[PDB]
C-alpha cells in the first residue's frame, strides 16, 4: 500500500496537469456552446447560456483549487466534485430538449464528459465505471422522458449499443492509462534501485534519434525476439486488446446501423463483410503474435514480424481504426434527405480513433478529422452549424487524448529501455 501511495505522489503532477487541462477544455466547451446558444437559440437565452457561463467561473474556481495544498491531499475528491457538476450541467442542458437543439449535440456532451471522467479525472475504476454508466442511463432516460414532440423497441437497444461502445473505449482507455502509469513508476523505480521526458511537444518523437529508430522497430523486434507477454502493457498484448476493441466497436456500431433498416444498400453489406473478414483476420494475427500456438511455421512467422514493422502496422492499423468509421458511411446513400442516426453513430466512430495507442497519434487523430468526421461534415453541404461545433469539440478531445496517451506509451517504453539498460549493467 506504500508503493501505491509512492506511485500516486510521483504520478500526481501528471494528474494535476491532466485534471487542469480538463478544466480548460470543459470551460472551452461551455464557452463555445454559449456563443452558439446565444445566436441560434436566442429564444431562451438567460436559461441556456447562464448555466454554461456559470460553469465557466466554476472551472476557474476548480482551477484555483488545483494550486491549493488541500487538492494535493484529496485530489480524488476534487475530481469527484467536478464530475457531478459536469454531470448535472449536461443533464440540465439535456433537460430542456429555431427553439430546438439536435440530439447529436447532446450526445457529444454525453460522450465528451464520459471520456473526461474515464481518462482525465483519475477516479477509481469502480467509481468511474458506475458513475459513468449511471450518467449514461440517466442521460438516455431523461432524453426519452423529456423529449419535445413539436420538432421531433430497437431504438432503445441502439442507445445501449452506442453507450456500450464509449464505455468500452473509456474503460479500455482508463485501464491502459493506469497500467502504463503503474508500469512506468515501477521501472524508473527499478532503474533508481539498479543504479544503487525527451519528447518534443509537436512531433511526439524521442529527442534522441537512435531511441526514435529503436522505438519504431520495437514491436517488430518484440515478435522476432519472441518476448513473453509479461504485463498488461506488453506491446504485443497491448495490440491484442485494441484490435479486440476495434472488433467490438465496429460490431455494435454496425449493429445499430442495421437496426435502423429493420433494404440496406449493397455498399452497406459489402463494406461490413470486408470489415468483418479483415477484422477476424486482424484479430487472429493479434492472438497469434501473443500466444504463438504450436501450429505456427516459419513461413507464417516471417509475415508476422513483417506486419509488426512501423510502416505496415500503420498501413493496417489505419484501416482497422477507421473500420467503424467506414461502417457508418457505408449506410448512407443519395436518399439522405436518417441524419440523426449517422451523426450520433459517427460521434462514436470518431471516438474509436482513441484506440490503437501503439499507432502514431498524429495519424489517428488526423484520420478522425478526415475520415471519421469529414465525410459527415461536407455531406451536409441551425443543424449545419451545430454539427460543426459538435465535431470540433469531440475531435479536440480526441486529438488531445491521443496526445496524452501517446506520450504515456512513449514514456512507458522509455522506462522499459532504461530499466532493461540498467539490468545489463
Residue 234 is placed in which grid cell? 506488453
Pairwise CA distance, residues 369 & 202, whole Å? 18
Nearest to 214 by CA among 3, 1, 67, 414: 414
In a domain, 162, yes or no: no
Does residue 251 sit in the same domain as residue 390? yes
Does residue 137 sit in the same domain as residue 242? no
Strand partners, 199: 206
Q: Which long-range contacts (CB under 8 A, 24 or more apart) does 269-275 make?
A: 270/330, 271/326, 271/327, 271/330, 272/327, 272/330, 275/250, 275/323, 275/326, 275/327
Nearest to 390 by CA among 21, 29, 45: 29
Residue 50 is placed in which grid cell? 447562464
Method: cryo-EM
Angstrom distances, CA of residue 227 to CA of 71, 219, 222, 230, 248: 41, 10, 6, 8, 27
Cα angle: 142, vertex 174, 75; to 5 degrees: 85
Nearest to 352 by CA among 241, 242, 254: 242
In a domain, 156, yes or no: no
Does residue 138 sit in the same domain as residue 185? no
Contact 136, 163 (CB under 8 A): yes
In a domain, 123, yes or no: yes
Contact 152, 254 (CB under 8 A): no
Give Cβ neighbours of residue 33 (< 8 Å, ≥ 6 apart). 52, 93, 389
Contact 342, 260 (CB under 8 A): no
Residue 375 is placed in which grid cell? 465525410
Angstrom distances, CA of residue 56 to CA of 61, 68, 86, 93, 401: 9, 19, 11, 15, 22
Resolution (A): 3.1
Give Cβ neighbours of residue 420 (< 8 Å, ≥ 6 apart). none
Burial class (CB in 10 A: 0-12, 13-18, 19+), 337: exposed
The number of beta carbons lying within 10 Å of the beta carbon of residue 66 is: 16
In a domain, 13, yes or no: yes
Pairwise CA distance, residues 247 & 241, whole Å? 9
Does residue 184 sit in the same domain as residue 225? yes
Pairwise CA distance, residues 189 & 168, whole Å? 31
Does residue 70 sit in the same domain as residue 193? no
Angstrom distances, CA of residue 256 to CA of 53, 246, 289, 414: 35, 15, 31, 41
Q: Which 8-state DSSP code applies to residue 98?
A: -
Does residue 184 sit in the same domain as residue 113? no
Does residue 184 sit in the same domain as residue 291? yes
Does residue 140 sit in the same domain as residue 187? no
Nearest to 107 by CA among 44, 177, 38, 162: 162
Indicate the residue among 113, 129, 149 that finishes a domain: 149
Does residue 143 sit in the same domain as residue 221? no
Pairwise CA distance, residues 211 & 215, whole Å? 6
Contact 345, 111 (CB under 8 A): no
Indicate the residue among 111, 131, 149 that finishes a domain: 149
Angstrom distances, CA of residue 412 to CA of 94, 170, 261, 402: 39, 20, 45, 15
B/e letters for 314-330, b = 16+ CB within 10 Å, e = fewer, are bebbbbbbbbbbbbbbb
The number of beta carbons lying within 10 Å of the beta carbon of residue 200 is: 10
In a domain, 161, yes or no: no
Pairwise CA distance, residues 380 & 388, whole Å? 10
| Chain position carrying cell 450518467 | 135
Pairwise CA distance, residues 302 & 304, whole Å? 5
- The range of the structural domain enclosing residue 90 comes to 2-149
Give helix 339-351 / helix 103-119 axis angle, nearest 10°: 20
Nearest to 81 by CA among 48, 13, 40, 127: 127
Does residue 79 sit in the same domain as residue 187? no
In a domain, 155, yes or no: no
Contact 70, 51 (CB under 8 A): no
- In the Cβ-directed half-sphere of 388, how many Cα atoms lie within 13 Å? 8
Nearest to 179 by CA among 122, 135, 224, 231: 231
In a domain, 172, yes or no: no
Pairwise CA distance, residues 163 & 168, whole Å? 9
Does residue 327 sit in the same domain as residue 226? yes
| Chain position carrying cell 434527405 | 337
Looking at the structure of the chain, the number of domains it has is 2
CA quadruple 323, 325, 326, 331: dihedral, nearest 10: 130
What sections of 98-147 are H helices per DSSP? 103-119, 125-145
Indicate the residue among 149, 166, 192 that finishes a domain: 149
What sections of 146-265 are H helices per DSSP? 154-195, 209-216, 218-224, 235-260
In a domain, 167, yes or no: no
Does residue 226 sit in the same domain as residue 121? no
Amino acid at each position: 500500500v506504500n508503493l501505491e501511495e509512492a506511485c500516486l505522489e510521483r504520478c500526481f503532477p501528471q494528474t494535476q496537469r491532466r485534471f487542469r487541462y480538463a478544466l480548460f477544455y470543459i470551460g472551452f466547451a461551455c464557452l463555445l456552446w454559449s456563443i452558439y446558444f446565444a445566436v441560434h437559440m436566442r429564444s431562451r437565452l438567460i436559461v441556456m447560456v447562464a448555466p454554461a457561463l456559470c460553469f465557466l467561473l466554476v472551472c476557474v474556481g476548480f482551477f484555483l483549487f488545483t494550486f491549493t495544498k488541500l487538492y494535493a491531499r484529496h485530489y480524488a475528491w476534487t475530481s469527484l466534485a467536478l464530475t457531478l457538476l459536469v454531470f448535472a450541467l449536461t443533464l440540465a442542458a439535456q433537460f430542456q430538449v429555431d427553439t430546438c437543439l439536435s440530439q447529436v449535440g447532446s450526445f457529444s456532451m454525453c460522450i465528451e464528459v464520459l471520456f473526461l471522467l474515464y481518462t482525465v479525472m483519475h477516479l477509481p475504476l469502480y467509481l468511474s465505471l458506475c458513475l459513468g454508466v449511471a450518467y449514461s442511463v440517466l442521460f438516455e432516460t431523461f432524453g426519452y422522458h423529456f423529449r419535445d414532440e413539436a420538432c421531433f423497441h430497437w431504438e432503445l437497444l441502439s442507445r445501449g449499443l452506442l453507450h456500450g461502445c464509449i464505455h468500452a473505449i473509456g474503460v479500455h482507455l482508463f485501464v491502459m492509462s493506469q497500467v502504463r502509469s503503474r508500469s512506468t513508476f515501477l521501472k524508473v523505480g527499478q532503474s533508481i534501485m539498479h543504479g544503487k521526458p525527451p519528447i518534443n511537444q509537436f512531433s511526439l518523437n524521442f529527442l534522441d534519434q537512435e531511441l526514435e529508430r529503436s522505438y519504431r522497430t520495437s514491436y517488430q523486434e518484440e515478435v522476432i525476439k519472441n518476448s513473453p507477454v509479461k504485463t498488461f502493457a506488453s506491446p504485443t498484448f497491448s495490440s491484442l486488446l485494441d484490435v479486440f476493441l476495434s472488433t467490438t466497436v465496429f460490431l455494435t456500431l454496425s449493429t445499430t446501423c442495421f437496426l435502423k433498416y429493420e433494404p440496406p444498400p449493397p455498399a452497406a453489406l459489402a463494406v461490413f463483410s470486408a470489415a468483418l473478414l479483415l477484422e477476424v483476420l486482424s484479430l487472429a494475427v493479434s492472438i497469434r503474435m501473443v500466444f504463438f500456438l504450436e501450429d505456427v511455421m516459419a513461413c507464417t512467422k516471417r509475415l508476422l514480424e513483417w506486419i509488426a514493422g512501423w510502416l505496415p502496422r500503420h498501413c493496417i492499423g489505419a484501416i482497422l481504426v477507421s473500420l467503424p468509421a467506414l461502417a457508418v458511411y457505408s449506410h448512407v446513400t443519395s436518399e439522405y434527405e436518417f441524419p440523426v442516426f449517422t451523426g450520433s453513430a459517427a460521434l462514436i466512430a470518431v471516438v474509436h480513433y482513441c484506440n490503437f495507442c501503439q499507432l502514431s497519434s498524429w495519424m489517428r487523430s488526423s484520420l478522425a478529422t478526415v475520415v471519421g468526421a469529414g465525410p459527415l461534415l461536407l455531406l451536409y453541404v441551425l443543424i449545419g452549424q451545430e454539427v460543426v461545433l459538435v465535431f470540433f469539440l469531440l475531435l479536440l478531445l480526441v486529438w488531445f487524448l491521443n496526445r496524452e496517451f501517446e506520450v504515456s506509451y512513449r514514456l512507458h517504453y522509455h522506462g522499459d529501455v532504461e530499466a532493461d539498460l540498467h539490468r545489463t549493467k
